[PDB]
TrEMBL record:
It comes from the Bacteria. Residues 2-305 form the Thiopeptide-type bacteriocin biosynthesis domain. NCBIfam families: TbtD_PbtD_pyrid (NF045556). Pfam families: Lant_dehydr_C. This is PbtD.
Length: 319
């Protein structure tokens, strides 16, 4: 059902290349979407379930761009291969990892299946529907970033909006997830945590204001939560049928808290929230936000909500 094209582009800043692809994902019927990926080296993937654009049309648009604005980053294959072998085990990727693509090249590629990770073809199809809708939204987000808006700031707004609209209890409920994710990432890194805290202090006033603005309602926040709304029903149904599948002070506390077990973890509302937050994190990846940066945002979001509302995620976890 799907066609895939890989654009090998070794500079981590894909944003202009993505914007050049906008007509290909905007001009013909069918679902189309893009993501960033690492197999055979850094590359952009374009996915289509209908027969247009053709390979020839894809080359007409993106060949022109690669010749005008080529990547000048050089990969280090010797260091990348072992990293990719580990990623492949972790992400359950069975595709060949070699040879690495040459920089600034276009390829047809074989679409991969994620059923074994997501739980069913129906769950995979729902993620494809999300990607199709979200990729359209991403072009406007990336136009803003290229134009000079803060990438992390746009992502922060998506996260706050998702927690306020889609968590039970709104922002002062959903923010506990942000702490959880930051503390799981940090895995005992006191020195990194202190660096994050010190940067957060410089940002606090602006970040608290952004939290209050998003909670009041912003056009971007409402647009993102509107998009997420489209997946809530089907998501609840796949979660309920089974079709959609840390040693830290915080997580130790949580594991001893019976409300976590009985009213949070197993609740359909938390499962739904967590699905829609995970879709938000996928969007952040599409927008070029790395795993460390997503985890920093989680730290900043939790800290901002705590300061604005005078609440404490660790106190909630302890119970
Ligand atoms: N002493 C009794 C109590 N314990 C709790 C707890 N709530 C949580 C909680 N945890 C996560 C978490 N998310 C993660 C994650 O990894 O995503 C871990 S904990 C997300 C959200 C909540 C809350 N929901 C609400 C709501 O009003 O509905 C408020 S706080 C953990 S213990 C509430 S009252």
């Amino acid at each position: 059902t799907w066609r895939r094209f890989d654009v090998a582009y070794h500079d981590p800043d894909l944003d202009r290349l993505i914007l050049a692809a906008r007509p290909l994902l905007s001009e013909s019927p069918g679902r189309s979407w893009f993501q960033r990926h690492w197999v055979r080296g850094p590359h952009l993937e374009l996915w289509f379930d209908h027969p247009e654009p053709s390979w020839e049309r894809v080359r007409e648009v993106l060949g022109t761009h690669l010749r005008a604005h080529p990547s000048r980053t050089r990969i280090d294959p010797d260091r990348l291969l072992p990293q990719h072998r580990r990623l492949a085990l972790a992400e359950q990727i069975d595709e060949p990892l070699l040879p690495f693509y040459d920089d600034n090249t276009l390829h047809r590629a074989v679409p991969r299946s994620r059923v074994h990770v997501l739980g069913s073809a129906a769950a995979e199809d729902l993620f494809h529907d999300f990607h199709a809708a979200a990729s359209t939204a991403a072009f406007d987000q990336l136009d803003a970033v290229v134009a000079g808006e803060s990438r992390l700031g746009l992502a922060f707004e998506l996260m706050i909006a998702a927690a306020h609209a889609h968590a039970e209890g709104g922002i002062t409920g959903g923010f506990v997830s942000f702490r959880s994710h930051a503390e799981a990432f940090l895995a005992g890194a006191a020195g990194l945590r202190e660096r994050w805290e010190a940067e957060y202090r410089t940002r606090a006033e602006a970040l608290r204001a952004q939290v209050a603005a998003v909670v009041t309602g912003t056009p971007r926040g409402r647009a993102w939560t509107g998009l997420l709304d489209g997946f809530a029903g089907r998501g609840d149904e796949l979660i309920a049928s089974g079709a959609l599948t840390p040693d830290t002070e915080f997580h130790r506390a949580l594991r001893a808290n019976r409300t976590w077990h009985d009213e949070v973890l197993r609740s359909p509302s938390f499962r739904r929230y967590r699905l829609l937050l995970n879709l938000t994190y996928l969007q952040m990846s599409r927008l070029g936000v790395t795993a460390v940066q997503r985890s920093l945002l989680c730290h900043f979001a939790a800290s901002a909500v705590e300061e604005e509302y005078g609440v404490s995620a660790i106190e909630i976890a302890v119970g």
